[PDB]
Amino acid sequence: GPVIRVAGDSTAVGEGGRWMKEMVEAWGKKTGTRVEYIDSPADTNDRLALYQQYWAARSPDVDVYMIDVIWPGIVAPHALDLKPYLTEAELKEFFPRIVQNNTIRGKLTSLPFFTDAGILYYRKDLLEKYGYTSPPRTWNELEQMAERVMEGERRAGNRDFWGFVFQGKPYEGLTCDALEWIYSHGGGRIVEPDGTISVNNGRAALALNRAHGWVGRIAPQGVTSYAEEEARNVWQQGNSLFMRNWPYAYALGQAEGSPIRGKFGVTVLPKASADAPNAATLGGAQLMVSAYSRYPKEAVDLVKYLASYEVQKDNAVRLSRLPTRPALYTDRDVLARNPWFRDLLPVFQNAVSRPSDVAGARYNQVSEAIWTEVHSVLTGRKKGEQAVRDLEARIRRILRHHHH
């Protein structure tokens, strides 16, 4: 009978790949269907390039793909329209915002699987050791606390200790960190949902200059090569006061034999001043049935299972990844394991989106311009003022003649 083949998530990032293959195998066993799991590179933009090879070839060799929240506009031609397979009631069990994200020109490209948002991880033991009673609310506070804790920890002999780690590698994760910096300084959304390229402004420039000011100071020099797992590993070995990362790092940092188990909390990222908006970049994964799958019916059943209440629950409890079902945020087991889901739910719902809706199929080119110009500031090659001006010019070229 059929073999349903699934490309999604990466065994190179936390436990996602392993857990996903487990879920797929469990569906296989439950239904008596053969399945195979195809692994992927770590970085989402590398995964896109890989999957684009299959799509270009109209390959039937993958039936289901896990896609990023930024992809529906790019991948729509390669997606089976899911809309005929779900009732309005079934669809309403997911966050409307994400269903809408995943719907391009009325086609439901994919089902919401897990969402995501950038948050601040902090060492509560260290904050208390140094006389602080709350995590920082402003970037200036983050910097002050990071300087003082680092000076103390370094003096006590931890030469590996830093104040802050984040994603500064030139790749999609940097676009995410940078949208947070820019938006939390009142500098806008880089490209606004109406199409306006707003990024050339003094607040955005300041946000980038501030980030530059972290590099090799409160953050490792090597941060300009860090993706999610590089940041996480410095943090999880106990060597960073703060980290910007996604929810998944929480369950990993609490696991038995984690050096930082019980020593950390999470909160909303800081901002420039009390009247700036809170910034958490919207991330996450959706499940797409390939337009080139020879087994659409079976693929859709697998996607419905993966997106189901109990599989999302398992994802939440075991991997601390965010459900796309509002009902799971009131589930007693989910909340008992992850009490911060309740506190940060409004942060997750107000998460700020990268400009994938407005750039559509050109999003990946837009994002590359963003991470390359941002990276130039992080390395001290350009000032934020120059970079945001060059970025405006590049995005104008990229999006000239594109309409949403």
Ligand X SMILES: OC[C@H]1O[C@H](OC[C@H]2O[C@@](O)(CO)[C@@H](O)[C@@H]2O)[C@H](O)[C@@H](O)[C@@H]1O
Binding residues for ligand X, rule: CB under 6 A, are 9-10, 13-14, 16, 44, 68-70, 116, 172-173, 176, 228, 246, 248, 283-284
- The 3-state DSSP class for residue 369 equals helix
Residue 374 is which amino acid?
V
**What is the rounded CA–CA span in Å between residue 146 and residue 150?**
6
Least distance to ligand X, CB of residue 314, Å: 14
**Judged by CB, which is closer to ligand X: 93, or 116?**
116
**Judged by CB, which is closer to ligand X: 170, or 186?**
170
Least distance to ligand X, CB of residue 50, Å: 13
Structure tokens at 143: 């910097």
Instruction: Compute the Cα dihedral for 82, 86, 87, 91 and give only its sign.
Output: negative
Residue 354 exposure: Cα atoms within 13 Å on the Cβ side: 32
Least distance to ligand X, CB of residue 246, Å: 4
- Answer left, alpha or beta for residue 157, where phi above 0 means left and psi between -120 and 50 means alpha: left
Least distance to ligand X, CB of residue 38, Å: 14
Least distance to ligand X, CB of residue 174, Å: 8
Interior/surface letters 139-178, b for 16+ CB within 10 angstroms, e for the rest: beebbebbeebbeebeeeeeeebbbbbbbbbbbbbbbbbb
Neighbours of 130 (CB within 10 A): 15
Nearest to 372 by CA among 352, 393, 402: 393
Structure tokens at 188: 């806008």
**Judged by CB, which is closer to ligand X: 51, or 295?**
51
Least distance to ligand X, CB of residue 266, Å: 13
Least distance to ligand X, CB of residue 337, Å: 16
**What is the rounded CA–CA span in Å between residue 245 and residue 68?**
16
Least distance to ligand X, CB of residue 224, Å: 15
Q: Where are the beta strands (DSSP E) in 298-357?
A: 322-323
Question: By Cβ distance, which residue is nearest to ligand X?
Answer: 283
**Judged by CB, which is closer to ligand X: 136, or 170?**
170
**Judged by CB, which is closer to ligand X: 11, or 138?**
11
**Judged by CB, which is closer to ligand X: 47, or 203?**
47
Structural contact between residues 119 and 247, judged by C-beta atoms closer than 8 angstroms:
yes
End-to-end CA distance of the chain: 43
**Judged by CB, which is closer to ligand X: 126, or 378?**
378
**Judged by CB, which is closer to ligand X: 16, or 136?**
16
